Symmetry: none
Subunit: 162 residues, 10 copies
Amino acid sequence: LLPNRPAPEFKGQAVINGEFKEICLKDYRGKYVVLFFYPADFTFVPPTEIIAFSDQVEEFNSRNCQVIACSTDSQYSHLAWDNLDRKSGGLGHMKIPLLADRKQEISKAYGVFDEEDGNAFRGLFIIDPNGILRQITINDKPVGRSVDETLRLLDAFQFVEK
Amino acid sequence: MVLLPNRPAPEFKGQAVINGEFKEICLKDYRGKYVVLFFYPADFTFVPPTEIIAFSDQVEEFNSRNCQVIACSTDSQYSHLAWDNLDRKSGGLGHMKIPLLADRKQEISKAYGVFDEEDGNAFRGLFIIDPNGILRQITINDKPVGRSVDETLRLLDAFQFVEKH
Amino acid sequence: LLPNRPAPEFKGQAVINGEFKEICLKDYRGKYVVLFFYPADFTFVPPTEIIAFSDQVEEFNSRNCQVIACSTDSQYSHLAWDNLDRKSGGLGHMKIPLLADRKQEISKAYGVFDEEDGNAFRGLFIIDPNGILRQITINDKPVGRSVDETLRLLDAFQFVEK
Amino acid sequence: VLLPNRPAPEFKGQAVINGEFKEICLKDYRGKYVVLFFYPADFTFVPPTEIIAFSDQVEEFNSRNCQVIACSTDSQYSHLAWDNLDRKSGGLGHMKIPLLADRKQEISKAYGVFDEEDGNAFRGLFIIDPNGILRQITINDKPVGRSVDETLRLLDAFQFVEKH
Amino acid sequence: MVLLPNRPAPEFKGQAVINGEFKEICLKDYRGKYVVLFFYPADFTFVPPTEIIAFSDQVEEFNSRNCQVIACSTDSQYSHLAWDNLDRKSGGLGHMKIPLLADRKQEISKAYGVFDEEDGNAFRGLFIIDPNGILRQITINDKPVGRSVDETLRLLDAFQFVEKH
Amino acid sequence: MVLLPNRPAPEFKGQAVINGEFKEICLKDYRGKYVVLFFYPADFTFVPPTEIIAFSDQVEEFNSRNCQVIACSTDSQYSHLAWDNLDRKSGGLGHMKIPLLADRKQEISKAYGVFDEEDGNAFRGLFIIDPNGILRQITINDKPVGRSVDETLRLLDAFQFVEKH
Amino acid sequence: LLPNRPAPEFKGQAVINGEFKEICLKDYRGKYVVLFFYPADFTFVPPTEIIAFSDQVEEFNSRNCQVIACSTDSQYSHLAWDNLDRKSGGLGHMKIPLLADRKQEISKAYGVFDEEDGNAFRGLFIIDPNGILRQITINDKPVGRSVDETLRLLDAFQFVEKH
Amino acid sequence: MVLLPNRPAPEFKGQAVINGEFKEICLKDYRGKYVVLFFYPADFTFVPPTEIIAFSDQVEEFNSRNCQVIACSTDSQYSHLAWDNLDRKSGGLGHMKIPLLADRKQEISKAYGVFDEEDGNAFRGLFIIDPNGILRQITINDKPVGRSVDETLRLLDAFQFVEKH
Amino acid sequence: LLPNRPAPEFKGQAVINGEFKEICLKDYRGKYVVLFFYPADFTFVPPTEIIAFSDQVEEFNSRNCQVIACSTDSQYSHLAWDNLDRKSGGLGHMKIPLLADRKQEISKAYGVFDEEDGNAFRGLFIIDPNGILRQITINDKPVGRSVDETLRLLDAFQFVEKH
Amino acid sequence: TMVLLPNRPAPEFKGQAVINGEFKEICLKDYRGKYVVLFFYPADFTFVPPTEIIAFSDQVEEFNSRNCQVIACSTDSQYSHLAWDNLDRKSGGLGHMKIPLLADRKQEISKAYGVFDEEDGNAFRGLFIIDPNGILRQITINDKPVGRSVDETLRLLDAFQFVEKH
């Protein structure tokens, strides 16, 4: 894995605002892509920083968009996190698709998923509009992803590409 | 392709959700007793999965021959508990005294031989084992069909009666 | 095995109402099937499996499901166990095809057979009109299966399909 | 590879002697010459029962060691149930000879017998010595029989030649 | 391992003899006639007899039944000629009117599966073949015993009766 | 493919450049403190790696919280010092107090999952590790960017924040 | 590396006199090449042998040869030793092609290389226009050969072709 | 392809005809003296060819020089015996004063490399060995041609002249 | 190897009547050839074995034949045995073809090639114009080859090939 | 195989040489504690025509005065070296040698050092120098139809001696 190449991308089903739509990277290219993984769902109190990405869409959208989220939790769990409200738990709602990744292949491609914990690590890899992977980053379990740095790397890449 | 009964039972490791607390479970952690390891594909569903809780409510009856009815999915633990917390009306199972297991690291499912590989889930089977760790019965179903508790009770009574008799 | 992939096609020599008939899997098609195993011929007293399906066969054919009784015993042996009478400790006159696996093929194909005892244990399989495996059941040597659940599985598979 | 003057393709199986069931091992008949003959199936379509002739000649065999070792690829139950039927009504009536079951087709695959194509064994008559060594091989495939006279003759010819 | 009947018979060709000739004589030469192939360990071996002459004098019985009797040893051609031309008294044969075959390079013996590794001579077996190039009957003995012509005639009668009648 | 930020780390030796001094800098010499290892493609490449030299001035901030700040180009040692010998304005590194490490033999680069095969190239490497041999975080961003000095402190403080409490 | 067999190919960054370039052996036909190897940049030696040779090139290039140079180091770095003053720690401004292999390709190709210090041993090869090198030479690290003798062996190879 | 000259000789074992009787002999039984061992394809003839009998009627030159040459062929013991008991004139060879070694199976001949694939007969050849079991000289010939006794007599004298004198 | 099979072909040059002349097995035919090997050039032991072969050529050619020698030595060594003199360490100007095997291949082919001392054994086999080898015989180090036996085997050979 | 490296141990060799007419087996091990110079050459009698490199052979004492044992090394046998050595320089042959005429008929040492030429079955020219610890300080292969220089070897030897103490 080096950050220049098309990514062994993915095939899957996702949750887009209540509706189930199966997506593949190829449905995107000609547009910038970014993909964040993040651990299993429905965990207790802790920040669930993923929601930060849903409300922050427009900032991502100045060029292109659709940061996705993969988990071994597949369909139903992602739908259940997408529907239920912030007060109780999970994403109050999301204008972004949550990936399936039930078969872990999406994870097994990208170099994530420490084998013994039954799930993946954190996210945020970047893919150019021609489908080439510009950036790789992985975080350990007890930490979150930063929203600002993704936009900084993204914009810097917009300036270096142009 | 598959494995034969009367052979030792396929070992498993995982953690599950008991009466609301947590429990590390291994085949070895519980055997004085015949067990029912019946599977089910995933957490939640669009559809009304009304066979879910059905095995759980009768377990006291299963325990008279020293037995227990366990369920498992390849979905995560937190997902199992969050599914446990829902109401029958709302489509979730009620609060049960039976655990529900999880692979996620692909352990319990791959041992017993159930998988579609496409849905990353179990093929919804039911196995029966003896207290000495050898497998009494294998059954596997398809996704939409369920297992019957009565037939399970018949299999249990017939298999339990033969041991020392 | 698994309830998805195509069924382990077989060519046996069966007993239909006394006469030898070579059958494929494919020749019996468009109406489900139950492929069921039993360990041996001339088992001491009980014909208490086998014939259980024969008296209940009306119920199986009304749902279109056929019934295949198999053993690793030969043709001739099946005819000889069939020709004996129930009172005398025999299958009596059988109105269902007795398959006769003969040598090792069909039993281990379907995945049961035996190592030490060279006989299948006890199977019950369900197949659909297009030849793919619907349901697998195996019990053990000493105990058997009940017919009602087989009928329930059949109806459950039929009502869900359309 | 199976030839004469070789250790015997040992077996066990379960058998039927005079109506009962006894697990037998070749070694129980050690110290004696053996004549092992195979027959394709139990309860065969073709009616003629003729093999029972070897059972009728057993006195002659008892005059010199052995036993007739009637094993076939058929199972235990088939041999016992065909044994329980009578010669008159067809099928082997009763026997002063050991009937062994090959079943899982261990012994047949051992001896070089057991035609794979119809899944039934061939005619397997062979002779062995008291030392567990194979003296004689014969096959004469299914649609024919073995002669008892030639077997006892072969035995007699075989007994006088080793010491002198 | 062992040769199964109803299976095609292993072909053989060589330099042997017939009545003092050294002709070809390959299995393919009959095809439509029964053959009986019987082995014997060596030339100039027992001396007398050895019992092979039993097959030599009654060949008419085989020929009226449509058959051919081939004798064979791992010994050379000239050796076969020298043992055949020799006299009954001195232990030489009776000038066989049937071809006795000599595999010097073996492989005729090893094909049919009769080869003694301990010595390097044959194990003295008896095979019967079909008119269609298919193997019918196999019999093998040990070194010191022998073979009977009557039983062979019995097998012939039975196989011809099943073939034609 | 790449490794994972959980299991231990691919230890290293090399020599160094620290304040002009080498001292061989073995991984084991760096125990007891968090480390941030950052890679860059070449020496005297000053046109794109502007600001990479700017990394030298904020290191105190890294050191007060107990950390290393060490880096490398996977290029030559003496070359790191000789590039370190010029002034920022004059087209030089000025003088950096960060340990500059150099694996001439491209070992460390291939270990960490960097080193683009076609041209000897560390893209831009950045790893974070805990005081004993374990890797906390990985990031690599292609050719052009110089990452950021600021965000790494956020990652460091957060990583200290979850274990400390 | 047999002298009677064709020479291992090379293409690379060049840094011809004063600036930069990209060069391959194949560009040279009817004219020789001299392949020069040497350890890393800016460490210690007043000649690397680069000085005695490159300053004396009038005799070396007149014989149809090139002599170039090669080391394992970054592209910019060869230019950087080229860029500094004769005194102090720089070589001076060298007029000659510098072959920069950071991927160790060319070094490991001619077989002059080691993974210990990741550098190359100082070698000298001579190459004919038909790709037949006729001579192989390698020294150790602390020692050089000489400016004169390489040229002597060279002359021996140059006068001999058709005569 | 050939064993090799000057190399130790390959062990061989078989049975032979000594003074009319049978003795299993190996070179190792002799050692201790120069040995010569030759070969011939088969045993018997209706025509005259002689060859080996030249060695047989006078062994004196060989026995006085400490040699004791052995004859060997691929054929049974009994065949060699049957050729040995006869008279030189009229079809048999003499009474051999050299041990006739009988390769029944494919071993001594195939070992020494004189085996002819085209049949079960060896090529006619002669090897010479020393008291220490090493081969001094290898010689062969095509089958239909022959061997010289005189030259065989000369080479021994040559070896006695060269190794010790 | 084995008789009656075609002989492994060989090519080489060495010394034929003092001059060179690279020769190949296939170019001859029409005559029996006897290829005889000899261990080394310029040996202490007396050469006279081979000398028997050099002076006796009339008879060698009279049998419809050609007698070539062989060594793991090069052409020039054979030249030094040729161009010097019969009397001291050389053998005439040879009326017999010697072999030029430098790379000791031909020795390895015929199955001789002593491995320990890198020298050949006695060689001397035989062939026919139809390209198949009739007879093999080899001695080892000290002893020599006999000419009389070559004449005897030849005489034995003519009656069998002609009749 | 093909490529030898300095600072690496030198491949050890054994063989039978010609010293002053006498044939005696020599081994690398006798030269420990001392520098050795192994110089190759394709064949006897051939090229460059004789004796050319004879320049190195007759003046050897000065080369011998500071360590540095010098070897001959050709694909020919001992006896051949003896016959080419016995002729006088004038007659087109190597003179009477005060240095080892060692060689390999068995292609042992030559194919080891990587100087063996397969096409002409003889080794190429060139040489190697070794240190008292059996380690290779120089490679320098040349070619068959050409020659060497004595000076490069003589000065380089002193430089290599200059590095061990200084």
